[PDB]
Design a protein around this ligand. Structure first.
Ligand SMILES: *[C@@H]1O[C@H](CO)[C@@H](O)[C@H](O)[C@H]1NC(C)=O
Ligand SMILES: [Ca+2]
Ligand SMILES: [Ca+2]
Lengths: 196, 83, 82
């Protein structure tokens, strides 16, 4: 079995490990992925936090806070920032090669960041169903990547991510009326074909 | 006001409302604590820690148990689920 | 004019409730407002506007006597016409 790969294509979409594009415009802070899931120690707790990103625009600067080995290293606005160095500095590593910030954290973990929005965490063979969050469980089964925090499969992913937010008193996002044209392209058929 | 003004300056005060015979209004289930954490551990919550290193803030909050669920305090045993 | 539900988080303005009291955060724009149950407006604001924000809560300087600088810019003795 090969190394899976999340992604955050554009402002509001998510690609799971097993491979499942789905839509989730949120504005609160959300659990991209973690290990503390049911009956396990809880080693790493990668998070993601967006601001003004329910409608994609030149706005929506992300904030990423990753919690491993009792550490707190986070990044936004181009650079990375350490708030609490972790104990085992040996596995730590940062490679600012090209557009990206490649970022190792251990034998079986890695992260990538295009300095603008993309978040592509990369895992190894080690876990094989030890995680949960937005990216799902990493089991090979692709339809069980909507297993909400309350341990059931949903069908409408807008209700999925609302379970995984951190601040349980901030805003749950609104079920949008589905349509093939977003806000501007809605009733502007001309512009739709120049983008198409 | 004088309580908060001194609190903001880096020097908090405690329990002053015990004998003052005036507590600020709050809805049912809660009354005015002093220096409660903003990250109130509620019912439908993920058990995560040492991210909420924010400063300590005044305001009314639930009893020791009695977790929050939709604007009221409710006992930890009766935590619902959602679908 | 459209009444929305609560909470609400558009445009980088989380509109939340903390400690049973309502909050409005603008950390990108450097302010945190809130209200209590009785009604007591409060405004927390960064050090970035030191000697900037002139208005009804006065400038963010060190002094406290000179913080009536009108919309023209005029030190006034009356806390009322200001
Ligand atoms: C404040 O700003 C004014 C003009 O805006 C300037 O004249 C003054 O030197 C500054 N100093 C203080 C203490 O505000
Ligand atoms: Ca899966
Ligand atoms: Ca002043």
């Amino acid at each position: 079995v090969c190394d899976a790969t999340c992604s955050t294509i554009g402002m509001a979409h998510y690609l799971t490990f097993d491979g499942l594009k789905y839509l989730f415009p949120g504005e609160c802070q959300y659990v991209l992925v973690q290990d503390y899931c049911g009956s396990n120690p809880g080693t790493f707790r990668i998070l993601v936090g967006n601001k003004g990103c329910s409608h994609p625009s030149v706005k929506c600067k992300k904030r990423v806070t990753i919690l491993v080995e009792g550490g707190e290293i986070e990044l936004f606005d181009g650079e990375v920032n350490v708030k609490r160095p972790m104990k085992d500095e040996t596995h730590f590593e940062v490679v600012e090669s090209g557009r990206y910030i490649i970022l190792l954290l251990g034998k079986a973990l890695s992260v990538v960041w295009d300095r603008h929005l993309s978040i592509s965490v990369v895992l190894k063979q080690t876990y094989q169903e030890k995680v949960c969050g937005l990216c799902g469980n990493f089991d090979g089964i692709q339809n069980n990547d909507l297993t909400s925090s309350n341990l059931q499969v949903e069908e409408d992913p807008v209700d999925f991510g609302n379970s995984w937010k951190v601040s349980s008193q901030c805003a749950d996002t609104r079920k949008v009326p589905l349509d093939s044209s977003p806000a501007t392209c809605h009733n502007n058929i001309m512009k739709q074909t120049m983008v198409d | 006001e004088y309580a908060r003004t001194c609190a903001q300056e880096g020097m908090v005060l405690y329990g002053w409302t015990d004998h003052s015979a005036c507590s600020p209004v709050c809805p049912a289930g809660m009354e005015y604590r002093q220096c409660v954490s903003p990250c109130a551990r509620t019912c439908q919550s993920l058990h995560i820690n040492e991210m909420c290193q924010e400063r300590c803030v005044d305001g009314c909050s639930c009893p020791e148990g009695q977790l929050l669920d939709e604007g009221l305090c409710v006992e930890s045993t009766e935590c619902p689920c959602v679908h | 004019d459209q009444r929305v539900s609560m909470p609400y988080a558009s445009k980088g303005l989380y509109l939340e409730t903390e400690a049973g009291y309502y909050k409005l955060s603008g950390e990108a724009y450097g302010f945190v407002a809130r209200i209590d149950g009785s009604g007591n407006f409060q405004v927390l604001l960064s050090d970035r506007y030191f000697n900037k924000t002139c208005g009804l809560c006065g400038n963010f300087n060190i002094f406290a006597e000179d913080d009536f600088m009108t919309q023209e810019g005029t030190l006034t003795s009356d806390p009322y016409d200001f």
